[PDB]
Symmetry: C4
């Protein structure tokens, strides 16, 4: 019986995922397990996940715009966006306003936007977009306020889990597989 | 049913948390999962957690003084304190005395102090403060000697879990949520 | 009751493992838990596993050729191959073609090849070799398309688990144990 | 009911732990979760654990000699030994012979030695010492051949778990606690 990201998901959600044209992702706690590795000189590192990376490229490959949105002013996140070919917006005071800006740039509504975050700074956006989603490790204040929770944890495939849903809802999977079968 | 850091907590604890003016935290095993990454030249790194970071800022924002206290002489911990805007005391032979020094600096009693630690060097402080706490990963010798244990593990939101309680006990939640809702 | 990598495995698989002369391994998600540590300048690190290392040497010691195959252009993977004494092929657009090249270099058929991978870029190879395998953390699209799944996760002994099977199927165990018993 | 490392342990083991004068530890997979972090230039790091560190010092503080024994030629392990004040022997071809050498240096028998390891290179020693022990993540070939398994995993307190047993068997705990209570 074939894996389908869509079974056990409600019709309403699948319908929103089908119209997603812009997918935005918090960095820490969402593409990351929330950890910041500090070295002896205070320099910082984060761990991203390759399944998440593969998922994000596939969204881009399926004509969906992908954006990373972080309040931190980190070159890490920028370098990560470059490696996968995604937009990045760094040092953002308000994530809603950032998202709203990206809607105007691509000629989109908020109802065509997906946002994935894990904590308070993501909340303005989570409450404004057509399709908010939170990883399993999300702070309860965010979890409580978003219906769609991934089974997986941030930095352990939660973002891939989202990508798979969106791609499945947009009829993209069969062709993804066919491209990689030879 | 709204998430409340305070349900399933005894009245006595809530009442102590309500009077906390100074919150002190061990570094390793408390804001960290206990791990030290050693590089080929013996240089060390640690992992902090962004939920913990968000929690600590919120304590500071609510007018509660925050301090990190470590026996290790690490620039990591100092850099981390700077990034969040908190006091740091490094290389402490005795944590009780350090805490006691901080009480005098801010004109406080030990009854108005919270301390969170995971192992033996924290014990002198844990036994002296008004509100000791330990994360779930705490050594049993410490666990046994402190009533309040967080559900979460050090470096996986245990400190945020503490911050949430204190903030909740001090009536700070409703406004935290309002600030972030748009 | 002696541990045997071969119990609970079907005869057919054991028989294929017995004829393996070339063992190829994806890097990320297969010898790694899928994580990429990004530093402030975009420099990357990965974590390998020493049990996996011990397994790979033992394959080489038993006269089986070992190869690592990655699409990424990383010096990490090369350095890792050097440390264990195995062939490496980096930056591969198509893994099938790479494998096929290695068959010709060693005068082998695809039926004599094992390939272990976790995600889409491995699929062309997984579908072409005599003995595909996937770790437990493998993406479901890959899992679904390969019968042999290791109990262990990538970067947590999954590759050793494979090595053990192959070595067991090729009668190599008794002597491995004897070499190390004093 | 006070935590006792000794309950649920057989009398025979407790008796051997009571006479331990030399405690030797594999590095990788034993003080580490088996992971090797490779950076872009092939430089390696490992993660040690602070609970393990606290345990090792306490063994030293209780007059037990502690030694780290690795086949790898890593400055990491040396730097780690220095930080905790323990002997280190690096690049060891045969661990039994290394241990045997340390017995003669300290005027001890093999029956007064504890060895903790996780994989084949440790086996010669595990089979020669009075008290072998293996972490929960140990390779089955080693697990099968050693009776004492820690509940915890390497790099997640397995070595502390051992230290606690030995210290408890040697009547050391009460005084350890008393030293840290003020």
């Amino acid at each position: 019986m074939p894996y389908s990201p869509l079974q056990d998901l409600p019709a309403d959600l699948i319908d929103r995922a089908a119209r997603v044209r812009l997918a935005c992702f918090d960095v820490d706690g969402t593409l990351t397990d929330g950890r910041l590795y500090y070295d002896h000189a205070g320099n910082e590192s984060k761990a991203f996940n390759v399944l998440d990376g593969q998922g994000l490229k596939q969204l881009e490959h399926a004509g969906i715009h992908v954006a990373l949105i972080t309040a931190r002013a980190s070159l890490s996140a920028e370098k990560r966006g470059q490696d996968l070919g995604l937009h990045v917006q760094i040092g953002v005071k308000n994530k809603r306003l950032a998202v709203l800006a990206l809607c105007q740039e691509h000629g989109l509504s908020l109802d065509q936007v997906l946002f994935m975050g894990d904590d308070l700074p993501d909340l303005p956006a989570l409450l404004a977009v057509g399709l908010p989603v939170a990883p399993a490790n999300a702070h309860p204040w965010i979890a409580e306020r978003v219906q769609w929770h991934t089974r997986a944890r941030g930095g352990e495939g939660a973002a891939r889990e989202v990508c798979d849903v969106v791609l499945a809802a947009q009829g993209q999977v069969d062709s993804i597989i066919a491209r990689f079968s030879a």
